[PDB]
Design a protein around this motif. Structure first.
Motif, PDB file in Angstrom:
ATOM      1  N   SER A 192       0.741  -1.280  -0.064  1.00  0.00           N
ATOM      2  CA  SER A 192       0.108  -0.087  -0.006  1.00  0.00           C
ATOM      3  C   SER A 192       0.815   1.096   0.037  1.00  0.00           C
ATOM      4  O   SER A 192       1.016   1.962   0.948  1.00  0.00           O
ATOM      5  N   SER A 193       1.803   1.386  -0.954  1.00  0.00           N
ATOM      6  CA  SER A 193       2.656   2.282  -1.012  1.00  0.00           C
ATOM      7  C   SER A 193       3.028   3.148  -2.251  1.00  0.00           C
ATOM      8  O   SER A 193       3.624   4.091  -2.438  1.00  0.00           O
ATOM      9  N   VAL A 194       2.639   2.309  -3.408  1.00  0.00           N
ATOM     10  CA  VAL A 194       3.050   2.648  -4.873  1.00  0.00           C
ATOM     11  C   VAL A 194       1.649   3.646  -5.336  1.00  0.00           C
ATOM     12  O   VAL A 194       0.674   3.127  -5.340  1.00  0.00           O
ATOM     13  N   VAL A 195       1.831   4.684  -5.557  1.00  0.00           N
ATOM     14  CA  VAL A 195       0.617   5.494  -6.091  1.00  0.00           C
ATOM     15  C   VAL A 195       0.783   4.814  -7.912  1.00  0.00           C
ATOM     16  O   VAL A 195       1.789   4.901  -8.530  1.00  0.00           O
ATOM     17  N   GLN A 232      -0.393  -5.547  -3.733  1.00  0.00           N
ATOM     18  CA  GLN A 232      -0.617  -5.125  -2.453  1.00  0.00           C
ATOM     19  C   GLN A 232       0.452  -3.924  -2.217  1.00  0.00           C
ATOM     20  O   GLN A 232       0.041  -2.827  -1.343  1.00  0.00           O
ATOM     21  N   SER A 233       1.476  -3.810  -2.880  1.00  0.00           N
ATOM     22  CA  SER A 233       2.191  -2.721  -2.864  1.00  0.00           C
ATOM     23  C   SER A 233       1.311  -1.265  -3.227  1.00  0.00           C
ATOM     24  O   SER A 233       1.388  -0.210  -2.702  1.00  0.00           O
ATOM     25  N   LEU A 234       0.313  -1.607  -4.456  1.00  0.00           N
ATOM     26  CA  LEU A 234      -0.412  -0.462  -4.631  1.00  0.00           C
ATOM     27  C   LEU A 234      -1.041   0.401  -3.435  1.00  0.00           C
ATOM     28  O   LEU A 234      -1.667  -0.066  -2.770  1.00  0.00           O
ATOM     29  N   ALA A 235      -0.939   1.697  -3.351  1.00  0.00           N
ATOM     30  CA  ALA A 235      -1.494   2.698  -2.589  1.00  0.00           C
ATOM     31  C   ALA A 235      -2.901   3.104  -2.997  1.00  0.00           C
ATOM     32  O   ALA A 235      -3.967   3.593  -2.301  1.00  0.00           O
ATOM     33  N   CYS A 236      -2.892   3.552  -4.572  1.00  0.00           N
ATOM     34  CA  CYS A 236      -4.121   4.210  -4.872  1.00  0.00           C
ATOM     35  C   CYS A 236      -3.992   4.041  -6.501  1.00  0.00           C
ATOM     36  O   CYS A 236      -2.887   3.414  -7.118  1.00  0.00           O
ATOM     37  N   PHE A 237      -4.969   4.682  -7.053  1.00  0.00           N
ATOM     38  CA  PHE A 237      -5.073   4.396  -8.523  1.00  0.00           C
ATOM     39  C   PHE A 237      -5.386   5.806  -9.292  1.00  0.00           C
ATOM     40  O   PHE A 237      -6.708   6.045  -9.034  1.00  0.00           O
ATOM     41  N   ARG A 280      -8.274   2.106  -3.711  1.00  0.00           N
ATOM     42  CA  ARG A 280      -8.771   3.477  -3.840  1.00  0.00           C
ATOM     43  C   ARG A 280      -8.476   4.154  -5.028  1.00  0.00           C
ATOM     44  O   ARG A 280      -7.183   3.938  -5.478  1.00  0.00           O
ATOM     45  N   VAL A 281      -9.341   5.279  -5.418  1.00  0.00           N
ATOM     46  CA  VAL A 281      -9.063   6.032  -6.806  1.00  0.00           C
ATOM     47  C   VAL A 281      -8.717   7.282  -6.588  1.00  0.00           C
ATOM     48  O   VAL A 281      -9.175   8.043  -5.586  1.00  0.00           O
TER      49      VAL A 281
END
Ligand code: LU2
Length: 437
Positions: A250-253, A320-325, A343-344
């Motif tokens: 949950s870190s990568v934009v 899981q790295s993704l923080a948002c979209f 989240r977007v």
């Protein structure tokens, strides 16, 4: 069974119909997919699995019998001609299948060849429709064509719109193709939509790429006027990743805008400054047609950042790295964000992306609004982008939108599970095809 899947030129049309094809094939049906050869052979040359002959899936297969386009390079110009060759040719192809013990039980088309339910009608062949946008967008078009509720006109361009079982949109949150001001190269998509709403009478089933709980009450209301079936999402029905592994969860934009949207150079440069400024990690997809990044962008952000020309979006979205979209809010992109729990950050450009953005933010509750679309035509300053990146990853609702996200991902996997709403809508529709027979 043998069903005929006919799709208009374009990546965004063919992909979902293909996915509807790989799915009907999975259920003991033989599907023949077709699309204008001019763009068809481009799929040939550009796809690995071309077509030497059928390509089995489960106990069914997918054949390819492209429509002869009769069109070597020489939007409204082509649409009228295509309609001419299609009606000329499609009976000739169906008539071939008539004499080789292959009477076609059903046709499936998308809105951008809306004349197809007319050939289905004359030839005695039942007609169904693959709708590739939300059910709120379908209702926008249907109510508008039959003029059952008031929309913006030339005399009132900022009128609100109040659609049953929908939040009140605004003038610029209705699908942009219903707006009375539209670029003259685009009026031909407005006419295709509207023509499909005129042909709905001849159509016994509308298959919608959505699932029952995402647009629950809406689908119940319009199901009395209309034969609507939620069968989605279709993508779930049927070096980039190595890099994201090294990051914390949950870190990568994440930053895509599909394969048609082309932003403005000033908008690019405000995002690159935004990312630099708050110093977040990111994966920014920069598809080529040439956008320039600030001097020393790459060196400055470091291994915190990464620019690529293409991405396995579905995969990347499942990380899981993704923080948002940060998204342009196409329907399939809104649903890929929903189903995956992320989240977007909404950057609607055009069409129905302004409706879905209204939904992601204020309805499904899964993120933050960055822009209001082409009619806004306001270059968004980096200061605001940095604010929404903070709002969606650190701020007071950041975890409540995460919560809301992971619940629409639960419901999506239940919709597509074995005895879920989306799957039994498929089998039933397949069950209907036999009862005609
Ligand atoms: O309304 C639509 C508008 C556009 C479009 C809009 C603005 C552009 O500067 C452009 O180059 C294409 O592209 C579409 C592409 C589609 O597949 C469906 C649509 O409704 C549209």
């Amino acid at each position: 069974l043998h069903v005929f899947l006919v799709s208009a030129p374009g990546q965004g049309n063919v992909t979902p119909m293909l996915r509807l094809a790989k799915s009907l094939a999975s259920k003991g049906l033989l599907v023949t997919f077709s699309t204008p050869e001019s763009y068809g052979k481009e799929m040939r040359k550009t796809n690995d699995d071309i077509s030497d002959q059928p390509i089995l899936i489960g106990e069914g297969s997918i054949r390819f019998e492209f429509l002869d386009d009769e069109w070597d390079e020489n939007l409204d110009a082509y649409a009228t001609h295509l309609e001419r060759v299609g009606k000329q040719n499609l009976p000739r192809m169906f008539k071939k299948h008539e004499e080789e013990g292959r009477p076609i039980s059903c046709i499936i088309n998308n809105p951008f060849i809306p004349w197809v339910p007319e050939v289905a009608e004359s030839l005695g062949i039942p007609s169904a429709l693959l709708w590739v946008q939300s059910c709120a967008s379908f209702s926008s078009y249907y109510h508008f064509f039959n003029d059952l509720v008031s929309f913006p006109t030339e005399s009132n361009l900022k009128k609100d719109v109040c659609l049953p079982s929908m939040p009140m949109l605004k003038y610029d949150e209705v699908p942009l193709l219903l707006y009375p001001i539209v670029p003259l190269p685009i009026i031909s998509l407005k006419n295709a939509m509207l023509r499909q709403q005129k042909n709905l009478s001849k159509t016994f089933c509308v298959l919608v790429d959505t699932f029952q709980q995402l647009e629950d009450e809406l689908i119940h209301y319009l199901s009395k006027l209309c034969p609507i079936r939620p069968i989605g999402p279709l993508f779930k029905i049927s070096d980039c990743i190595e890099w994201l592994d090294s990051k914390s969860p949950s870190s990568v934009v994440y930053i895509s805008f599909g394969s048609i949207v082309h932003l403005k150079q000033e908008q690019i440069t405000e995002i690159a400054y935004a990312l630099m400024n708050i110093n977040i990690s990111f994966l920014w997809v920069m598809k080529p047609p040439q956008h320039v990044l600030p001097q020393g962008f790459l060196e400055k952000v470091g291994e915190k950042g990464k620019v690529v020309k293409w991405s396995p979006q579905e995969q990347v979205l499942s990380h899981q790295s993704l923080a948002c979209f940060v998204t342009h809010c196409g329907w399939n992109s809104s649903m890929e964000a929903l189903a995956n729990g992320i989240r977007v950050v909404t950057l609607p450009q055009w069409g129905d992306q302004v409706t879905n953005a209204k939904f992601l933010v204020d309805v499904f509750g899964v993120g933050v609004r960055l822009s209001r679309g082409d009619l806004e035509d306001r270059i968004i300053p980096r200061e605001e982008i940095e604010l929404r990146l903070l709002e969606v990853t650190s701020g007071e609702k950041a975890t409540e939108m995460k919560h809301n996200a992971l619940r629409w991902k639960k419901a999506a996997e239940e919709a597509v599970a074995k005895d879920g709403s989306s799957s039994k809508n498929l089998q039933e529709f397949v069950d209907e095809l036999n009862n005609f027979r």
